[PDB]
Write a protein that binds this DNA or RNA. Structure first.
Ligand code: UTP
Ligand code: CL
Ligand code: CL
Ligand code: MG
Ligand code: MG
Ligand code: NA
Length: 326
DNA sequence: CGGCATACG
DNA sequence: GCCG
């Protein structure tokens, strides 16, 4: 079991779901309390269990597994012995956890904003609606559409949205392409949004593209909210039987030279990308982001034609998106 | 002990 | 919280 999540395949479904969910509760709570380090350890330990080939049944099976020390091992032991971990249950039913979860799940509300509102005494969505002077326009949008945005996006929803994005993209710049990324590219059957990556085969033609896309979508009445730019975090109007629902849609534009890096960077998982960037820097001395891969000694960028190129650059076995579910 | 991913809106 |  290698130490970095990018060094091992992680399927979407696995053999330790209950154990990983418990550890991810503690990771989420650690983040709510400002401890990025503890969040990462608990996320990594959870991901190790996702990568195992069969269920953990005994504590001895944790020996030698990376990122399992006293705390994470204690959590797993209690779950194996009693089917429940007291620390996890205490977090679950704590007012702090439940409110930070409710608040951060809002589009436009992060941990720092949620924490301040918590300290000010706010607890519910109606508490926020009852004081709208304190909200940004983005947060007003996230709060107005909160109910729809709390409904899982389905794979059927994805196909319809890609068609309308392609239509708008085709008018905005003929020959431009739309690639599904994010969790649905990793094989998820549901999601909190739909993520797309847009490019054009002739380097440079993608410049200025996204404003032209957004203006056309807005003209077709399909944009319930959006902000030169190359990323947009929007809320789309998605038709439904006799009605419609709001759906979060992310659009990213990249030049074709950077497309492999942007595809890798936006396909995830979030933990997979963090681990891959950490691996690249700490083990290989290379700086990775969604634009490229930089050698800070030679002051050069690696040219990649594919995700396969990037894995090979970093000396890692290639992992298809479906195996990046760290 | 230091480190913990990344850049755009 | 854990790794090196
Ligand atoms: O903090 C973050 C968030 C996102 N991302 C990058 O953006 C991608 C999309 O980020 P999303 O937030 O849309 O997550 P997701 O598609 O993986 O899962 P859903 O909750 O949407 O179902 C991620 O998969 C990752 O590549 C990061 O690198 N860091
Ligand atoms: Cl590998
Ligand atoms: Cl770390
Ligand atoms: Mg997504
Ligand atoms: Mg997204
Ligand atoms: Na949020």
């Amino acid at each position: 079991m290698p130490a970095y999540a990018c060094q091992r395949p992680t399927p979407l479904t696995h053999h330790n779901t209950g154990l990983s969910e418990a550890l991810e509760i503690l990771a989420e709570a650690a983040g709510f309390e400002g401890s990025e380090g503890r969040l990462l350890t608990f996320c990594r330990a959870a991901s190790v269990l996702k990568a195992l080939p069969s269920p953990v049944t005994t504590l001895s099976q944790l020996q030698g597994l990376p990122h399992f020390g006293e705390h994470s091992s204690r959590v797993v032991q209690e779950l194996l012995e009693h089917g429940v971990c007291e620390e996890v249950e205490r977090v679950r039913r704590s007012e702090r956890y439940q409110t930070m979860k409710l608040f951060t799940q809002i589009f436009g509300v992060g941990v720092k904003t949620a924490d301040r509102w918590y300290r000010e005494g706010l607890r519910t969505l109606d508490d926020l609606r009852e004081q709208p002077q304190k909200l940004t326009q983005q947060q007003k949008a996230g709060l107005q559409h909160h109910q729809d945005l709390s409904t899982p996006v389905l794979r059927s929803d994805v196909d319809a949205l890609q068609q309308v994005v392609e239509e708008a993209v085709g008018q905005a710049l003929p020959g431009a392409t739309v690639t599904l990324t994010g969790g649905f590219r990793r094989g998820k059957l549901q999601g909190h949004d739909v993520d797309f990556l847009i490019t054009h085969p002739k380097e440079g033609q993608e410049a200025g593209l996204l404003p032209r896309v957004m203006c056309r979508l807005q003209d077709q009445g399909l944009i319930l909210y959006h902000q030169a730019f190359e990323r947009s975090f929007c809320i789309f109007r998605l038709p439904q039987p006799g009605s419609w629902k709001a759906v979060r849609v992310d659009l990213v534009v990249a030049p074709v030279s950077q497309f492999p890096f942007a595809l890798l960077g936006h396909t995830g998982s979030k933990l997979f990308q963090r681990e891959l960037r950490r691996f690249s820097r700490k083990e290989k001395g290379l700086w990775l982001n969604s634009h490229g891969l930089f050698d800070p000694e030679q002051k050069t960028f690696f040219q990649a034609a594919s995700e396969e190129d990037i894995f090979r650059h970093l000396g890692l076995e290639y992992l298809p998106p479906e195996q990046r579910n760290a």
